[PDB]
Amino acid sequence: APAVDTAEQVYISSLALLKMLKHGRAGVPMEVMGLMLGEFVDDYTVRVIDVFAMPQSGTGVSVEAVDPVFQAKMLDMLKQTGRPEMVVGWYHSHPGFGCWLSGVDINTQQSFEALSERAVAVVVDPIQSVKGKV
Amino acid sequence: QSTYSRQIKQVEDDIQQLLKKINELTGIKESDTGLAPPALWDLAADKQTLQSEQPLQVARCTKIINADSEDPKYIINVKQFAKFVVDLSDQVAPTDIEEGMRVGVDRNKYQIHIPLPPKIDPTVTMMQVEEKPDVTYSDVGGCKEQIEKLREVVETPLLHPERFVNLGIEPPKGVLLFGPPGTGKTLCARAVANRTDACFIPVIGSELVQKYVGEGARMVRELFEMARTKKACLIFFDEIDAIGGARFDDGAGGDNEVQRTMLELINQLDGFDPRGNIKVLMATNRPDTLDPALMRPGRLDRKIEFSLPDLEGRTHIFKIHARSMSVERDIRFELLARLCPNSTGAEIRSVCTEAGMFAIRARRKIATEKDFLEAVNKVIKSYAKFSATPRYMTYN
Amino acid sequence: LREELQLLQEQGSYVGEVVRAMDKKKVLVKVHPEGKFVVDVDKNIDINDVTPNCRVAL
Amino acid sequence: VIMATNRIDILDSALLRPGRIDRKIEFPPPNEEARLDILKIHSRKMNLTRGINLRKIA
Amino acid sequence: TQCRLKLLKLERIKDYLLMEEEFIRNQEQMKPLEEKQEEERSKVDDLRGTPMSVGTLEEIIDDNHAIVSTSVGSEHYVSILSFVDKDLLEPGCSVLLNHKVHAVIGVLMDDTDPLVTVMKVEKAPQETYADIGGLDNQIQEIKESVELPLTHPEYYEEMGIKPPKGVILYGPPGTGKTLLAKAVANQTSATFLRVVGSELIQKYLGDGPKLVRELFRVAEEHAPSIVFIDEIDAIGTKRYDSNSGGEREIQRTMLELLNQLDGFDSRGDVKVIMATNRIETLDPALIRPGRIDRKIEFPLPDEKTKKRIFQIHTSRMTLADDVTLDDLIMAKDDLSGADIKAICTEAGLMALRERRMKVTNEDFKKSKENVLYKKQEGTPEGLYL
């Protein structure tokens, strides 16, 4: 809705930024994805603290990868450590597509949105992490 | 006219230059070709971009191999010329994916989305078959005996194989067409094709021989197979003196090219399986200038006679040609026919037409008897003479 | 030099050839080994600004 | 289309045709004057020694 | 001169006004176009996806598909969706595909053959009609045979039956066989494709039957049309090898012609015009009618004809009113068009040596005695024969 949806300028920490670049890089052309742990303050500030990743596949991002089981499983670990984090959004890497969101990537983003209203979608370019511009 | 031509030359040059600028500049001026009915289609089009099944890549199934472990394996050749093995279609029948059949396979997943209409396996055979018209008996001179045999041999077994069973023989695998040229053989051939409702595929022998021999071999085999798919067909090989010439191979001449193409055709004539009710029709000057080796007489069947029109014989063609045409005459068909010497049918047919061209000269619009009389005298001399090589010394 | 890190990234740049310009306000360029591509007119060209058989930078 | 040839017997009659050929330019076989001229130009670059005469060579 | 000039000045000026008026229309003046079409273009280009990857549209399937061959190297079975209709696409043309996922966006552009570009030369004779006079009877015939069945259907329709399908122009060069083909073609404005016979026999084998069928087939697609086959004597005359001379090469090319012209494959009201300087090389089957129809023979120029043949050559140069035509008829006669070209060239050649930059009677006379001798000399005189 135009009356409550505003963009989320993401403050990305060292732990998230490095994690995402490395994970995509090794998998190539197998694409990796995951949920992002962080905290949400303001009506627009998201700090991305840390990430864990979902199943890689040789077709890359798909509906099959996204299951509530992985997420639910993680949350139980979050309690046990005594970490508080709610889910800020999700990430993926596209070596096999550009920054444009692929047809399977939108499907995957819609599911993740149902769980956290404020959801962000990130393209990582693992390939570019080899060169000095990322 | 030297001074006058320069003036005109300069004036065009200037006007022509200015034109270049105007044309380029105007263009279509940022318009859209689709207009209003495609707007709804744009929204669809976007959904397809997201989709993985679109775009499909056309390919063809080359070979059937089973070592099945999912659903039936086929090896297809992609048009980037990488071979890939794909599997049975996502929902469509296995009976639609065949050897030498075209298939649409996904660009991103490479599995058969849908099969497509068959054949694109040769490049060359597809090129060699050309357009087909129909001309009828009216237009082709004579109701003679020579004309009558063409019908009886070609039309009857293909139209009704029943007649040919009754007699106790098979419908011809082969059929031979012979007679010297300039008699309307091709014309007659077109005319029986319509009646029979038997598709005729015209073929040229000159395309078959090529610099490196082997292309013509694969072409001929592929060509028989295509025809075999068609039911009650004729493969009409026109103007062949490759598959049509002398039996001999020099062994450093273009004669090598002829001999490979002939040799596969012999294999095809017998077949990998026989060819009951399939006719190949071949045109030669006469059967004595055709191979005794490619001619293995049981298979070829009847040899259909066409011969050079006689003086009586040309009297007959000329009534057909004249009657078909719109002409106003006083003089008769027989006189003018006797007027002609024994030469070819073709001079005598041209008389009927030339009388119409003399009418435009004469400043009429339709022919008259005097135009007719003028046409015989010029035509007999013109076409016959001022032609042919002036040597038949030192040839093989 | 700092800025050069950002500047160097592209999707490459080529030398192509204009087979013909077209009066449809799009231009046909063929990259040297790869097939033909139709692309729109830019700001930097129109159709009086590219004429047949011009090798071009892309 | 300007033509050059070594000899006049290795040509086609069609080329030899007067209506196609506007002008015909005749060259003799190698002469003494031509050979003197070539030797002299090259001697400037070459070394020499006393008692060489290009005229005997030519 | 003065009579022409007022109109000439006005025509150039009318054309200037026409150029200048275009500029005001593209830059300022708009009413249906406006800001609105500008936006339609932006919106269509972004949806369409630049770069557009070229395809060729072979055929359209009505269900929202088309069979495209992408020009990159590997073909694709696309959908017809997005800014085009099935009927809006046309066969044998170049089309735009969305680069990301191939559906056929549309036909703006047409595809020309590679073959046709080389073959083709523009229609118009450098010697204007009614100044290719000299065998003036003969010039008329071609206008009747090739040009007329296409120009005027009335006579043909009443006449009935098949129309003409060619002419053969034969006899000694210089009687202007090329100028005639170009005239009829100019008038009709039928695409004039032109190939020399020597292209039919080149080093590669089977190029001859190949080139001739493609040339015709292209003429039928771009129809109505005139195909000119210039100077088919080469078939036998030339050889790059043993395979390129000899019977196989000669036959294949002749055989192709026979099927193509009237045979099964036929041709439309597309005419073939053949120039040949020798029908010694040519067969009785391509001198046969009803795939040649009227043949035009040019004989050697007659004494009276020769004066009219000489005038044409004189018109291309500077116009004579001081050449004695009788001396030319007296000196040589029953020699070609090519001989009249030979007298003219030699006159121009002597004037060139002085740096005289005109021809006059004097240049024609001086050169004329040597040229007649020279004609005999062209064919061997040996040692003393």
From TrEMBL, chain A:
Gene Ontology CC, one term: proteasome regulatory particle, lid subcomplex
Q: Which GO terms describe its biological process?
A: double-strand break repair via homologous recombination; double-strand break repair via nonhomologous end joining; protein K63-linked deubiquitination; proteolysis; regulation of proteasomal protein catabolic process
GO molecular function terms noted in the UniProt entry: endopeptidase activator activity; metal ion binding; metal-dependent deubiquitinase activity; proteasome binding
Question: What's the superkingdom here?
Answer: Eukaryota
* Keywords carried by this UniProt record: Hydrolase, Metal-binding, Metalloprotease, Protease, Proteasome, Zinc
Q: Where would I find the MPN domain in this sequence?
A: 10-134
What is the protein name stated in its UniProt record?
Answer: Proteasome (Prosome, macropain) 26S subunit, non-ATPase, 14
Query: From which organism does this entry originate?
Result: Rattus norvegicus
In terms of the parent sequence, the fragment covers 22 to 155 of 310
